[PDB]
Amino acid sequence: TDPRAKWVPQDNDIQACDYWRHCSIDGNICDCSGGSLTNCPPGTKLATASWVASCYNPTDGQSYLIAYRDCCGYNVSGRCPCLNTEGELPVYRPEFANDIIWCFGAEDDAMTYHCTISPIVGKAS
C-alpha cells in the first residue's frame, strides 16, 4: 500500500500483487482472465521466450527461479494488474528485464500482450 516500501511476499493468494511468484511480473496476472497460475487462457498463444527472477517463497523459506512467460495475440486483459521489480535489470541485461514483451516463439507469431504466467523452472543460483 506504500508503493515505495520493501515488497513482502505472501503464499496464500495468487490474484494479489504480493503473491511470492509475482516478484518480477509486469502486466497482468493470467489467472484473472481464465488462465491459471501457469497456463494461458483459451484463445491466446504461449510464448517460448521468458524473463527470469529469483523469488523467495515464504512457505518454505527457499528462493525460486521463475521464468515468466507471456500469453499473446490478444489485447491486454485489464484484470489484476501488477508491476513488481525484485532483481529486475535494465534492457541491456534482457534476461532479467521485464519491460519487454516476451511473446517470441508464440504460435501464429502472436506478439501482442495479454497476461503473464509464473511457473517455476529451478532453485536460485
Binding site: T48, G105, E107, I120, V121, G122, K123
Partner: protein, 355 residues
Amino acid sequence: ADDALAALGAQLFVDPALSRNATQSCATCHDPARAFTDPREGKAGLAVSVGDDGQSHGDRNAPTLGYAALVPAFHRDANGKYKGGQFWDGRADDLKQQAGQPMLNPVEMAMPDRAAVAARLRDDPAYRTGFEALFGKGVLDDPERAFDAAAEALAAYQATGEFSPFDSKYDRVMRGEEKFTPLEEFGYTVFITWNCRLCHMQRKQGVAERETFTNFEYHNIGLPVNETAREASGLGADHVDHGLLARPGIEDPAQSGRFKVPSLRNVAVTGPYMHNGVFTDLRTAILFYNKYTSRRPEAKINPETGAPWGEPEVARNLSLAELQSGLMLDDGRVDALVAFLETLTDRRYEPLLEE
C-alpha cells in the same frame, strides 16, 4: 546383494570374452576414461564405432552411459508423448532390455547367439561362483537364464554412483559449495530463458531432485545425414534412419526422424555430437539451432565445413514450435552457453576439459 550384483556387472563390463573374436568389451566403446564413450578412430573419425571384426562400422554415435540410469522405462505419457527407453530411438525398454543387444549385434560384439555367450561365461570359474550365488545353480547351463542374468548384472552396475556421481561444478554450485563465474552464470540464465529448457530439463515446471538435462522425450531437430559415417556403415545411400518409428510397435509416421533427448551432462567431453556424430565442436552443435531463428547468411552455414547445414534426413515431424524461438544466439551467448555446459562436467573428467 545389490552390492554383489553390481560387482559382477563391473567384471562383465570390461570383459572382452563377450565378443566373437574377444577383441572387445563394453568399456572399449564406453570408455570410463572418456565419460563412457568411444575414443577410437574409425573410417568416419569418432562419429561411429568399429565392431569386433575390425571392420564393420555402426551408423550411430556411441552415447555416454553416464546418467543413463535416471531414464524411466519406455512409455507413452498422458500428452501422447512417448518418453524414455534406451538407445537413440528408444528400441530397448530399459537398461536390462538393452544390455543384451550389443553382444548379439554383428556390427558390434557379434556373438552368433545366446548359447555362445553362455559358453564363454561357463568357461570362467569366477563366473560360475558369482552367477550361482546370485541366480542359483545351473544358471550358466541354461542359455536364456544366463544371458538374462548377464543383462541383469550389467544394468545393476550401470545404476551405481560411478555412472551418476552428481559431482559436476553445477551440482556443487547448486549445493552452495562454490559459485559460478559471471560467464557460466550468464550461460545458465540463457539456458533457462531460451528454448533449451524446453527439452534439456527434467521437468515442465518445478524443481527436479536429480536433474540430468533432458526430459527423456523424442524430437526431430532436422539433422542432415553424416555421409562419411553413413558410407562407413554400408547401409546404402537410400537408407533413412527413421529414429523412433523404427522401434518395433511404433507405427505412427509422426515419430519418423525423432530421437531421444540426450542428457547434457559431460557434453563438453563427449563429442562428436548428435546421433550420428555429425558435429565435431560443442560450439557447432549450439550454432546449429540458430538455423531456425537467425536471418544472417552465416546461420545457414556450418562453420566446420563452410557449407550449408544440410538437408534434414527426415524432413518432417520437426519440432518447429520449440525450435523457432524468434531469437538468435549472438557469439556472447554461445560463448556463455559453452561455458555453462562445461560446468556439467563430472569432477573426474574436469582434467579432460582442456583438450
